[PDB]
């Protein structure tokens, strides 16, 4: 259903229901912030999420003088299989903007990308792996 | 920010306001879709979200037996600089689950990851690039 | 200027007027803090003061026995030029005392150094680069 | 105390109390001016301060054509240890500005850097070497 | 003494002596956290307590799946001897516990372990090394 | 948490939870004392705490005359895991302090160290290894 879909641009996103958890910080080091979501689960099945930041550096290429500012979030979800082996399902979110980018342009990018992974038109692409 | 933030697990995410754009496919093949968000803009200033897919491959030495079902989305965003040059800002979202994962465990991961895109708690992390 | 100038040793330095900004931490680790003075500016035009630290290392062939306690601060300041390029002006302050130094001696040193930053006598030296 | 601190930007700094000394100039050569603060002390315990200037030169890199203009001040504080060996405690202040920088932009930098080493919060960073 | 000493298991440990100091962190380095207790002492005579973690790593050995989660706390209390030189008196504590263990057991173990070091029975053991 | 945690120096540590068990010694071997807490558990499920002393030895090095007097306590709490096997969760404590130390400072150190392990700020550090 990635075809004539629909997405609201420059819109406010909200969340209703669910169970409010808490992101507990574990270690901040090496431009990385390791944390975990507290759902009252065991250590082997947590919801660890890692926040990392890559600050821009001066360059000669990169038309504007500096490399892009990258911000990456990886959410880890341990899954237990039928046999009993443990696997981790991950979602990575990486945002690379030029340092000249305004906060309103980043907000538009953030909100449009949020609906890209919760709008119903993309359900089969994420779950069924269906391009059309 | 990233420290004591709350995320509503297994909630419903919606959108209000904004302008409804259609998204129109440009090019296909192979296991790779290319589209663009139509908002009445020029050819160089259009959004252009891309959709990639990596099907589960039958491995041997892996949990479950197969490799993971990778599904990537990249939203591009052209921006013109103070020197007149042209660059692109991107948001890359990769979902990597095992094929044994159910749709409901995937709908939870997407909703959790979508919240760390638009939740007000993680704003200084994306725009100010402030880990804490 | 630098010739017959007067510096008030062991005085009290204060500030009047101006706008009170908060300074916000960006990134930590390791023995290196990074912050930014928040004055409602864009990401490329923010102050961004950084804090470094070198702890006293126990040497052998040194006065007192250990190496010196180094403490560095670098205030950055973005500036755009007449050709549209971006550069950074910096102020670097390094304090290097022996571990046996008392707090009042460090207070005196910091007061003298601060005086040799804002005293009207040393204005041509910083801006006009006039040695005398 | 480098966290939610406070600094006045574009403010006037003043000094009260203390004992007005005099900076007597010793040697002015090689883009350097050696001087000493006169407190009626011995030669082995003076408050020697060195002023150095590094003028910009033409370049092809350095986006604006010139290297930065640097002004350095080193204040030396002889300390006598318990055993009896003599060490020197130094404070370096290096200001590097692009030559296009206005005098108001330099004044703002100087005033912010002044409070960076006399505000009561950073007292823990300079003496205790405490990042937070 | 040690023999026939009584320990109250699963007990709340209070404390009432006053002199509420503050643990201020200094550096972080590699998966560590070096802090110090702010009591107003000298710079090289303060009590620095260091924290460290050694999060479990998935092994093939370790009958239970993988290594334990050890947490260390070293409290360094410096001392000036009569002869004149300096020495540090340290108190290290480690918590090598299997990651599957619950938080109630850890609280039980922490209380039982901390029930030593202030119980009157062990006073001579900690001070005079009176084993028997 | 660890940052800005308060510890009350020179404090009386009480305990009120009940369940007054008894430490019964088992063996002595070489300058050691292996005991166990009598809670009615099984033979290989009881908690054994081992005490050991390492009295000073007159050296030529050791700036203070001779090595420190160390006292170790290891609390071994056994645990049966879900997989079925058995493991031990241990809490070791050491007091390597210089023999010239008075008993008052040793008591201060023991109170400060035992003020950890039951303080609320360090709960997350001991349980989830939440350094930051």
Rounded CA Rg of chain F:
18
Locate B8 and state its tokens.
Answer: 């509503």
Q: Find residue B84's DSSP bridge partners.
A: none
Look at the block and give the residue holding tokens 């409602």.
C40
Locate E52 and state its tokens.
Answer: 């460290």
φ, ψ (nearest 5 deg) of residue E55: -40, 145
Alpha-carbon span A102 to E64, nearest angstrom: 51
Q: For residue E101, which residues of chain F lie inside 8 Å, CB to CB?
A: 79, 89
What does the DSSP 8-state code read for residue F82? T
Q: For residue B130, which residues of chain C lie inside 8 Å, CB to CB?
A: 24-27, 36
φ, ψ (nearest 5 deg) of residue C104: -70, -35
Q: What is the per-residue DSSP string for A105-123? A: HHHHHHHHHHHTTTSGGGH
What value, to the nearest 5°, has the Cα angle with vertex D28 and ends D26 and D30?
Answer: 140
Alpha-carbon span C36 to C26, nearest angstrom: 7
What phi-psi label fits residue C107: left (phi over 0), alpha (psi between -120 and 50 degrees) or beta? alpha
Q: What's the first-to-final CA gap in chain E, in angstroms?
A: 8
Q: What's the first-to-final CA gap in chain D, in angstroms?
A: 5
CB B93 within 8 A of CB A117: yes
Locate E5 and state its tokens.
Answer: 């000493």
Contacting partners of chain A (3+ CB pairs under 8 A): B, C, E, F
Look at the block and give the residue holding tokens 């201060």.
F108
C17 vs D: CB within 8 A: yes
* Residue of E41, E117, E124 for testing the chain F interface, max F β-carbons within 10 Å: E117
The helix or strand, by DSSP H or E, that contains position C82, with its residue range, turns out to be: none
E105 vs F: CB within 8 A: yes
Q: For residue E118, which residues of chain F lie inside 8 Å, CB to CB?
A: 13, 110-111, 114
Look at the block and give the residue holding tokens 């002004």.
D71
Q: Where are the beta strands (DSSP E) in chain B?
A: 8-9, 12-16, 19-21, 24-27, 32-36, 49-54, 69-80, 86-97
CB F63 within 8 A of CB E85: yes
What does the DSSP 8-state code read for residue F46? S
Q: Where are the alpha helices (DSSP H) in D35-128?
A: 103-116, 123-126
Alpha-carbon span E94 to F94, nearest angstrom: 9
Environment class of F29 (CB within 10 Å of its CB; exposed 0-12, middle 13-18, buried 19+): exposed
φ, ψ (nearest 5 deg) of residue E64: 150, -10
Alpha-carbon span E119 to B38, nearest angstrom: 74
CB E42 within 8 A of CB C98: no
Cross-chain residue pair F110–E87, CB shorter than 8 Å: no
Neighbours of A108 (CB within 10 A): 18
Neighbours of C52 (CB within 10 A): 16
Q: Find residue D79's DSSP bridge partners.
A: D87
Q: Find residue A78's DSSP bridge partners.
A: A88
Look at the block and give the residue holding tokens 């465990």.
B105
F94 vs E: CB within 8 A: yes
E27 vs F: CB within 8 A: no
CB B109 within 8 A of CB A78: no
Neighbours of D27 (CB within 10 A): 10
Q: What's the first-to-final CA gap in chain B, in angstroms?
A: 6
E25 vs D: CB within 8 A: yes
Contacts for F46 with CB less than 8 Å, ≥ 6 apart: F36, F37, F38, F39, F78
How does E116-128 read in b/e, with b if 16+ C-beta sit within 10 Å? bbbbeebbebbbe
Compute the nearest-CA separation of A78 from chain F (Å): 17
φ, ψ (nearest 5 deg) of residue B111: -70, -35
Alpha-carbon span D117 to D7, nearest angstrom: 11
From residue B87, give the alpha-carbon distance in Å to each of A63, B15, B47, B76: 7, 29, 12, 10
The helix or strand, by DSSP H or E, that contains position F110, with its residue range, turns out to be: helix F103-115
Resolution reading in Å: 2.8
Q: Number of residue pairs across A and F with CB atoms under 8 Å?
A: 14
Locate A60 and state its tokens.
Answer: 């000669």
Look at the block and give the residue holding tokens 């692409």.
A125
From residue B83, give the alpha-carbon distance in Å to each of A62, B87, D65, D97: 12, 11, 16, 22
From residue A112, give the alpha-carbon distance in Å to each of B40, B113, C12, E13, F44: 16, 14, 54, 52, 60
What does the DSSP 8-state code read for residue F118? T
Closest CA to E40 of B35, D127, A81: D127
Look at the block and give the residue holding tokens 């033409």.
D58
Closest CA to A97 of A66, A59, A60, A52: A66
What value, to the nearest 5°, has the Cα angle with vertex B112 and ends B64 and F120?
Answer: 100
Chains B and E in direct contact, meaning 3 or more beta-carbon pairs closer than 8 angstroms: no
Look at the block and give the residue holding tokens 């997350």.
F124
Locate C47 and state its tokens.
Answer: 């102050």
Alpha-carbon span C3 to B122, nearest angstrom: 53
Locate A10 and state its tokens.
Answer: 């420059």
D132 vs E: CB within 8 A: yes
Compute the nearest-CA separation of D100 from chain C (Å): 7
Q: Number of residue pairs across B and C with CB atoms under 8 Å?
A: 23
Strands A86-97 and B8-9: unpaired
Q: For residue E42, which residues of chain C lie inside 8 Å, CB to CB?
A: 102
């Amino acid at each position: 259903a990635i075809a004539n879909s629909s997405i609201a641009i420059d819109s406010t996103a909200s969340v209703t229901g669910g169970t409010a958890r808490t992101v507990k910080e574990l270690v901040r080091n090496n431009s990385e912030l390791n944390a975990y979501i507290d759902e009252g689960l065991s250590f082997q099945a947590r919801k660890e999420v890692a926040f990392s930041v890559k600050v821009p550096k001066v360059s000669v290429s990169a038309p504007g003088g500096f490399t892009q500012a990258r911000s990456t979030v990886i959410l880890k979800s341990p899954k237990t299989l039928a046999n009993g082996n443990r696997t981790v399902n991950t979602v990575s979110i990486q945002l690379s903007v030029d340092p000249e980018t305004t906060a309103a342009e980043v907000t538009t990018m953030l909100n449009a990308a949020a609906q890209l992974l919760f709008d119903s038109d993309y359900s089969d692409f994420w779950k069924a792996q269906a391009l059309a």
